[PDB]
Protein: Ras-related C3 botulinum toxin substrate 1
Organism: Homo sapiens
Amino acid sequence: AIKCVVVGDGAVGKTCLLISYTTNAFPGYIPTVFDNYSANVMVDKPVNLGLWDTAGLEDYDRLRPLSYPQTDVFLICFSLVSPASFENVRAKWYPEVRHHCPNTPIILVGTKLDLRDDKDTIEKLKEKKLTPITYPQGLAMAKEIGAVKYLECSALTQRGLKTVFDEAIRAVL
Ligand SMILES: Nc1nc2c(ncn2[C@@H]2O[C@H](COP(=O)(O)OP(=O)(O)NP(=O)(O)O)[C@@H](O)[C@H]2O)c(=O)[nH]1
Ligand SMILES: [Mg+2]
């Protein structure tokens, strides 16, 4: 099995992405405490992928890193429509992962891709003087954190969803 650990701010869509990917179902917001999912996947070919779905809420900061030993690949996730979560990629998640796992490959994943170029979402953000994260900004952030790939997905439409796991696996094999 490959151990893939998924981290990122509360509500960015970690659980939706894992459940959408393993089951084709879309939940179902219940904040995660901790869950383990597993998929037998064909990449490039069969793989047992163990997915560790972590708590994004700050109450679990002291506990979350207990999950980290032995990880094969990390997914650091941020919502493409939440600039705070994007800044936390380098302000919180990158350092927390690296504190514990200096070497383990990171994939940076921008989530809720279906909302990024949604007009109502862009309007609401604009009122707040903010704008969705664009692909080149995500790429710059991937570079700044030495992520091995930057990928965008939607758990809702499944755009980009398979490639996230193909690349997590390619990162390890
Ligand atoms: N529009 C859209 N909404 C999404 C998508 N993925 C998740 N959401 C919404 O964002 C909310 C948070 O989703 P969830 O996966 O539970 O977030 P989480 O990162 O696992 N939060 P926690 O760290 O607290 O477990 C849910 O209401 C969910 O339906 C998406 O791909 N598109
Ligand atoms: Mg969750």
